[PDB]
């Protein structure tokens, strides 16, 4: 298979081939998922299920190897089924949550090479016979967040069937290579021309907003990515969810709008372009498919003349609607507007991305056979050296149906001080709070 458009996007953010094993085709560019498991576990059989999962999805066997400047995919035969198990200790709940977070951090702090199998690893942390945390980590070229939920769903299903516990049959998945074919086929349609023309004009003169770094690029400090984690307080999250319902906008639009307000106060800019990642899974043929589908999507909003936070949210809604309506794979949009990324590689600025995690919606614990499992979203333990961000700043929020929000601000430690970002995050939460408290107040 060829690289997908998303993997082509990542190539733009590659490190080149000069010494250091970093960036998105390096071993720190991974994604984790943690699930709380209730019920007795047969570790042997779970390990076998993990083998089944990797056999099932080609993307989890598709290494990427350096091939003269670029990266070549190669689908490999599944390697040995492997599972690490740790006894975390039979302790009180709050200590279980803590030791669980520490395990997640530890796993995310370790490398996982894309150049050879495995591309997925699993660590099971058992508290007692009937309570555990299951941690999956996958190279982020192979899996996005949605794909991690597919992997978990499949895994626990295949485990149950091996145990002889009744479970519904799994659908036959499409493979990511079939998606890769399809997106390229799709990108030759007449519709695409109209969309390229829409973008060429919409983004004329546009520059993704750059944030001034504390440490310049040319300092050459070693690449690292830190993650400051937070949960939106319940009263605040309720306010956001309620405001959004009444405004007829999504909670994402409201949070993004607050970010635009924050960038205005810090940069003075009124013409604000900020990329998000869309989920990139509008084609439901691929909902059972493991792969990384997400798509870099520039959102340009003109804030000039806004008389209130409500107006900001409404312009944002307009921007997102047209953006999703005309969405292109970014590696087929960027040629039309090549100066859009100027501040990305500048010596004293980096771009930021503001996203909502795209994941299957679940109300509460799920069941597969004799196990109950639920996803862990809220991590409050921050992390000094975790999953790689190729070259920038990432805001990432997961918005639960329940209304609760788990977020991260990730940044490169070779470019930003920890205290700078802590202040940035605190500013963001303060802007968000005043905004929804007083959405119609004048500026
Ligand atoms: O990103 C929101 C929220 O989700 C968690 C849950 O583990 O992290 C996921 O999203 C991060 C950003 O995309 C990834 O780096 C991470 O691998 C993935 O698990 C949080 O820790 C975060 O606050
Ligand atoms: O899930 C998105 C991923 O963490 C990512 C990939 C490329 C980026 C490029 C610039 C800034 C942030 C990025 C984040």
């Amino acid at each position: 298979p060829p690289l997908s458009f998303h993997q082509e996007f990542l190539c733009m953010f590659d490190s080149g081939n000069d010494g250091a094993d970093v960036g998105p085709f390096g071993p720190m560019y991974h994604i984790v998922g943690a699930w709380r498991l209730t019920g007795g576990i047969d570790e042997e059989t779970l390990r076998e299920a993990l083998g089944d999962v990797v056999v099932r999805h080609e993307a989890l066997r598709t290494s990427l190897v350096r091939e003269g400047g670029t990266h070549r995919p190669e689908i490999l035969p599944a390697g040995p089924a492997a599972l690490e198990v740790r006894d975390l200790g039979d302790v009180d709940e709050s200590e279980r949550v803590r030791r669980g977070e520490e395990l997640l951090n530890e796993v995310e702090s370790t490398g996982l090479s894309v150049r050879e199998l495995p591309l997925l690893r699993a660590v099971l942390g058992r508290f007692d016979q009937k309570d555990a945390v299951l941690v999956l980590i996958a190279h982020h070229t192979a899996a996005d967040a949605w794909a991690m939920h597919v992997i978990a769903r499949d895994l626990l299903n295949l485990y149950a069937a091996r145990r002889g516990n009744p479970v519904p049959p799994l659908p036959e998945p499409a493979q990511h290579a079939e998606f890769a074919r399809w997106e390229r086929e799709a990108a030759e349609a007449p519709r695409v021309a109209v969309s390229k023309e829409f973008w060429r004009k919409r983004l004329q003169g546009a520059r993704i907003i750059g944030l001034e770094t504390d440490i310049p690029r040319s300092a050459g400090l070693p690449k690292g990515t830190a993650w400051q984690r937070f949960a939106v307080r319940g009263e605040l999250a309720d306010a956001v969810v309620e405001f959004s319902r009444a405004a007829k906008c999504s909670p994402f639009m409201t949070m993004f709008a607050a970010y635009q307000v924050l960038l205005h106060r810090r940069t003075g800019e009124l013409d604000i372009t900020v990329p998000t990642f869309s989920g990139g899974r509008n084609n439901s043929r691929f909902e059972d498919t493991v792969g990384s589908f997400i798509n870099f999507l520039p959102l340009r909003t003109d804030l000039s003349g806004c008389a209130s936070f409500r107006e900001v949210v409404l312009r944002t809604r307009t921007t997102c609607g047209e953006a999703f309506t005309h969405e292109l794979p970014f590696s087929r949009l960027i040629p039309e507007v090549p100066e859009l990324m100027a501040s990305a590689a500048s010596d004293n600025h980096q771009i930021s991305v503001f996203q909502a995690v795209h994941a299957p919606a679940s109300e509460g614990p799920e069941q597969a056979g004799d196990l109950t499992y639920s996803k862990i979203w809220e991590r409050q333990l921050s992390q000094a050296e975790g999953s790689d961000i190729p070259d920038g700043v990432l805001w990432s929020i997961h918005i639960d149906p329940s209304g609760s929000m788990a977020g991260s601000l990730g940044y490169n430690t070779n470019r930003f001080k920890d205290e700078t970002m802590a202040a940035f995050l605190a500013d963001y939460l303060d802007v968000l709070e005043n905004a929804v408290a007083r959405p119609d107040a004048p500026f």
Side-chain angles (χ1 to χ4, degrees), residues 9-10 13 29 140 277 294 351 353 355 389-394:
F9 159 75
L10 295 178
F13 283 85
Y29 184 70
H140 191 17
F277 279 110
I294 56 171
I351 57 152
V353 176
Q355 75 175 11
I389 285 160
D391 201 321
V393 174
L394 183 68

Side-chain angles (χ1 to χ4, degrees), residues 31-32 227 229 355 357 376-377 379 396-398 406-408:
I31 179 170
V32 304
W227 294 88
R229 301 210 167 92
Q355 75 175 11
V357 179
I376 292 166
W377 285 111
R379 302 163 63 187
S396 174
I397 306 304
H398 174 263
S408 287

Side-chain angles (χ1 to χ4, degrees), residues 257 261-262 264-265 303 305-313 431 435 438-443:
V261 177
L262 173 64
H264 173 69
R265 333 244 71 159
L303 272 63
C306 288
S308 71
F309 183 62
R310 190 173 305 271
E311 298 196 13
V312 180
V313 183
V431 160
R438 306 290 157 198
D440 298 296
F443 288 109

